[PDB]
Design a protein around this ligand. Structure first.
Ligand SMILES: [Cl-]
Length: 240
C-alpha cells in the first residue's frame, strides 16, 4: 500500500497474509480475505506459481511476533475456471483456498463480510485497501499492515480513456487514482473494504495496478468485484 497508514491490529480481522516457502523461511506474496474458518478468498494470479503456500491469520507485523498469529497450510486451491494468466484484464482474478485446518476466531481473526450479489458502489464510495504490499512503486513490503483510503471510481469513469479504458470491466471495482495512495505489489488478493449501511464489507479482491507504477494518477487500483462472484464462491464451498 502506497500512502497508507498503519492499521490498528484489530481493525481488519479478515485480512490474511498468503505466503510461500522460500528456503527455510516463508515470504509474504499476497493478501487474502478469510471467508470461512477454513476458506480464504484471494486473487487467482497470486496462485499461478507452483509454490508451497501457507496462510497466516491474526498477522499484523510480518517481521515480528505479534502473539496472535495462526499459521495454516493451504490444502486445496480452486481458481476461477475462466481465469487466464495471460489476460488479467479479462477478469476472473479470484481463487478460493481451502485451509488444512479451521482457524479459531477472535478479535484478530474474523470472517470477512461479503456484499450481496450484484451490489455496485456509487462513484466515490468510501473504501480502505489493506495490505502488506509495497509502500512505494518499486519499493519494499510493509512490515506492519497498512491501510489507505481509496474512494471508488465507477465503471463509467474508470473505463474512460484517461483512466483504464477497455481494460476495466464491470466485473471489477476501481478505487483511488489520486496519484498518492494505492495498492502495490504484495497487496494483490487482499480486500477492498467499503462502508455500506454502517458496516464494512469486502467489495474487492486486489487485482492489478498500472505497469507504470502503483500510485499513478487516473490509474486507480483495480479489484475483482466480489459481488460478481457470490454464487461462484458459494458453489465452490458447497462442493468442497
Ligand atoms: Cl475484516
Amino acid at each position: 500500500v502506497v500512502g497508507g497508514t498503519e492499521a490498528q491490529r484489530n481493525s481488519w480481522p479478515s485480512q490474511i497474509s498468503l505466503q510461500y516457502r522460500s528456503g527455510s523461511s516463508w515470504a509474504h506474496t499476497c493478501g487474502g480475505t478469510l471467508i470461512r474458518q477454513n476458506w480464504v478468498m484471494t486473487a487467482a494470479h497470486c496462485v499461478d506459481r507452483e509454490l508451497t503456500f501457507r496462510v497466516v491469520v491474526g498477522e499484523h507485523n510480518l517481521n515480528q511476533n505479534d502473539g496472535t498469529e495462526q499459521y495454516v497450510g493451504v490444502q486445496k486451491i480452486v481458481v476461477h475456471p475462466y481465469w487466464n494468466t495471460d489476460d488479467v484484464a479479462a477478469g476472473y482474478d479470484i481463487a478460493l483456498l481451502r485451509l488444512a485446518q479451521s482457524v479459531t476466531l477472535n478479535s484478530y481473526v474474523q470472517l470477512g463480510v461479503l456484499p450481496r450479489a450484484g451490489t455496485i458502489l456509487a462513484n466515490n464510495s468510501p473504501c480502505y485497501i489493506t495490505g502488506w504490499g509495497l509502500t512505494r512503486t518499486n519499493g519494499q513490503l510493509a512490515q506492519t499492515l497498512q491501510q489507505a483510503y481509496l474512494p471508488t471510481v465507477d465503471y463509467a469513469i474508470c473505463s474512460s480513456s484517461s483512466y483504464w479504458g477497455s481494460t476495466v470491466k464491470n466485473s471489477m471495482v476501481c478505487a483511488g487514482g489520486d496519484g498518492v495512495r494505492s495498492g502495490c505489489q504484495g497487496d494483490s488478493g487482499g480486500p477492498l473494504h467499503c462502508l455500506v449501511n454502517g458496516q464494512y464489507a469486502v467489495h474487492g479482491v486486489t487485482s492489478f495496478v498500472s505497469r507504470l507504477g502503483c500510485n499513478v494518477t487516473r490509474k486507480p487500483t483495480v479489484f475483482t468485484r466480489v459481488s460478481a462472484y457470490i454464487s461462484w464462491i458459494n458453489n465452490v464451498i458447497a462442493s468442497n
